[PDB]
């Protein structure tokens, strides 16, 4: 089955209030396993699961000094971004950066990642071949070139194709008796006596993984053409997820409306109804 190893860097500049705040955070799949947050006494890499407590102590010293490096490096990308977009200090600008491996039904990189966002907008992006670049505007174009002439993708390519996949295989082992396995949604339909001669049929789905699910309501077998409330899939906290979908129907006519759950963990697509 397919998994991933993904780290998310976030740096925010805060003028007057001292130096930028850096925050790295690792994630095996959707489970978070590590952290680094410069908003600290003497910051250092810490686990975020009981399973990461079993790794060699040399591990933390490494990622602490490595992240301190990147933190200092992101202070440079911020002040450089100021020069490019011709902006100015005083203000708050933030940098985001998602990098990491993706594996499929085998231990061999499927897609690698290394991408930056500046002020809620893409900036630069290592493409899927892991040796070319994509820039969103003309400021990022100046970066793309610096990276192209130097050959700086050779370092990401080498990490992502290599070290990265070895370590995901390491972490999926360590944390094999906890990390969410594919799990099927438990579904039911409550009803709620909504003001004025019509009951609100709400449809639920609870305790599933991964988060990718489809809830839909149908009237008399076919697509709905009234309306329905649909809240985004949400973390329970225990590692599984929750979604509901609700259509409003007249009293007595509740039997003609069926909810329709669709999940990978269901072998046959589910169809519910009131009672």
């Amino acid at each position: 089955g397919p998994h991933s190893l993904r780290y998310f860097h976030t740096a925010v500049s805060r003028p007057g209030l001292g130096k930028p705040r850096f925050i790295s955070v690792g994630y095996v799949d959707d489970t978070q396993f590590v952290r680094f947050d410069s908003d600290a006494e003497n910051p250092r890499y810490e686990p975020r699961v009981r399973w990461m407590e079993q790794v060699e102590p040399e591990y933390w010293e490494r990622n602490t000094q490595i992240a301190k490096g990147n933190e200092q490096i992101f202070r440079v990308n911020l002040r450089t971004a100021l020069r490019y977009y011709n902006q100015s200090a005083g203000g708050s600008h933030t940098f985001q950066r998602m990098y990491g491996c993706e594996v499929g039904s085998d231990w061999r990189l499927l897609r690698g990642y290394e991408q930056y966002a500046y002020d809620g907008c893409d900036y630069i992006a290592l493409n899927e071949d892991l040796k070319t670049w994509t820039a969103a505007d003309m400021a990022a174009l100046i970066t793309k070139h610096k990276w192209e002439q130097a050959g700086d993708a050779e370092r990401d390519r080498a990490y992502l194709e290599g070290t990265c996949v070895e370590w995901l295989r390491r972490y999926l082992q360590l944390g094999n008796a906890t990390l969410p396995r594919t799990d099927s949604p438990k579904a039911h339909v409550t009803r709620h006596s909504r003001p004025e001669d019509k009951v609100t049929l709400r449809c639920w789905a609870l305790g599933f993984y991964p988060a990718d699910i489809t809830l839909t309501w149908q009237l008399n077998g076919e697509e709905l053409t009234q309306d329905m409330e649909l809240v985004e899939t949400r973390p329970a906290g225990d590692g599984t997820f929750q979604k509901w979908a609700s259509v409003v129907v007249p009293l007595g006519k509740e039997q003609y409306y069926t909810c329709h759950v669709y999940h990978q963990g269901l072998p046959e697509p589910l169809t519910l109804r009131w009672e």
Partner: peptide
């Protein structure tokens, strides 16, 4: 484990 960035924008 992470790695030490070797490029700056």
């Amino acid at each position: 484990s992470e790695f030490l960035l070797e490029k700056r924008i």
